[PDB]
């Protein structure tokens, strides 16, 4: 399967198997995990080693991900400001979780949607957010451009 | 091997190799060809069997295909009205030709983008991603949904 | 369906679906809703988040909309003077609600009836007030021109 | 967007780059151009497609733009009456051209300065600050509020 992807030094995009790799996460100084699924466990919750957030979304055509953008960015920024890394994952690292990372890059590194997509896809070539999510990323771009978030 | 792909009784999608299958073209009653590249030959041109239109695109970062939509739709319709089939092809991955097919299904059979995409990909499972064309289709969808002329 | 239409920075024209989209309304800083129907609910009334006004009109050939113009304008102006936006809707955003917006623009931005129509239609191409309403907009123009309101 | 900006059905605002987009101009039915610089070319002049007016300003300390308002309004109106669009452009930041657009909205659609500014910036989020033009618009607002001719 595809390896865990460093996006920034403190932000890693991955799949459910990555979220179980305790040794890798501790090597990378990860202290925060975002699980972008309704149904997966928070792996290693009971060892109390990470701070977790669930964004309980499906990968469907009606799922609203935009509603979770602000919360996710705040959590990435919490990890960032205290010098820890954050792992964000869904099942494959292809769609839900990639959409959140692209959006983070749009807001916080001011990349266009196209540039943030290519930035992530260059690092993790299997990403492919569904068209619903792609439409949300375009509306998010509009709203960022007009100062509307 | 493979061959060109039925989309509607009068509309077929294919790649570079598929366009060279003169036997399949005649059996499927294809009378019209759209070649969505600047550099490929008009296959079978010298035989004088078909009506051609070249849309001289590239599969590049800034290629505008929306500009050709109205012209391609008119030519599909002229074949439709004549009782002949039209093949639209580009190259391996069918990214440019699929973009125009999806557009035609969105405008003329009123499918949403996601539904037209799924309709085409169900028939033609390999569609190379192109973020630029995907964005032109999402904008074309917004325009159709808003009733823009 | 057509997307919600910003007419002015504090005035949005929409359909019944738009009036349910709580997240969009709060993003747009909407604090006021006008519902131009007799029979639809005031969506989200029970969350006590918006100020509402019902203009309980039908889309018929006998319906008097002029009688509601002054009330609607006062409400739009309440929203405007306190720095909030207003969403006005009927079922489709096509006829009743569009007529009210066109009339607001005639009185408060001094647009002719033709110019206010084209202004709204340019932003929301699906609008089409019925001929009864169009006749009322013309007599409203007369009364504005003569100072008779 | 990467092109000129609709303000009213017949009035568009843009920069140096936007003025060079001959396809966008024709598609939007722009027949008229106001170039608010002393030094830029009249783009597309040799094609004989458009009616031009140069307002030979600079974006400087003491540049008076108020002096051109009446002339620019007459030209906008001539286009409006003709059924054609008018593009007004200057350079990156659109400070001079936006000043004239805001002036026209204040005089002809009677928006307050702040509301006209917000209307334009909502459509065109980058407006370079110019304290001198802002002061001219504030004095023009006072004149209009006092009924000065």
Swiss-Prot record, chains A, B, C, D:
Entry's localization field: Cytoplasm; Nucleus
Location of the Tyrosine-protein phosphatase domain: 3-146
Active-site residue numbers: 90
Domain of life of the native organism: Eukaryota
Tissues in which the protein is found: Expressed in keratinocytes (at protein level). Detected in brain.
Subunit structure: Monomer. Interacts with MAPK14.
UniProt record similarity statement: Belongs to the protein-tyrosine phosphatase family. Non-receptor class dual specificity subfamily.
Function (record text): Protein phosphatase involved in the inactivation of MAP kinases. Has a specificity for the MAPK11/MAPK12/MAPK13/MAPK14 subfamily. It preferably dephosphorylates p38.
Protein name: Dual specificity protein phosphatase 10
Organism: Homo sapiens
Name of the encoding gene: DUSP10
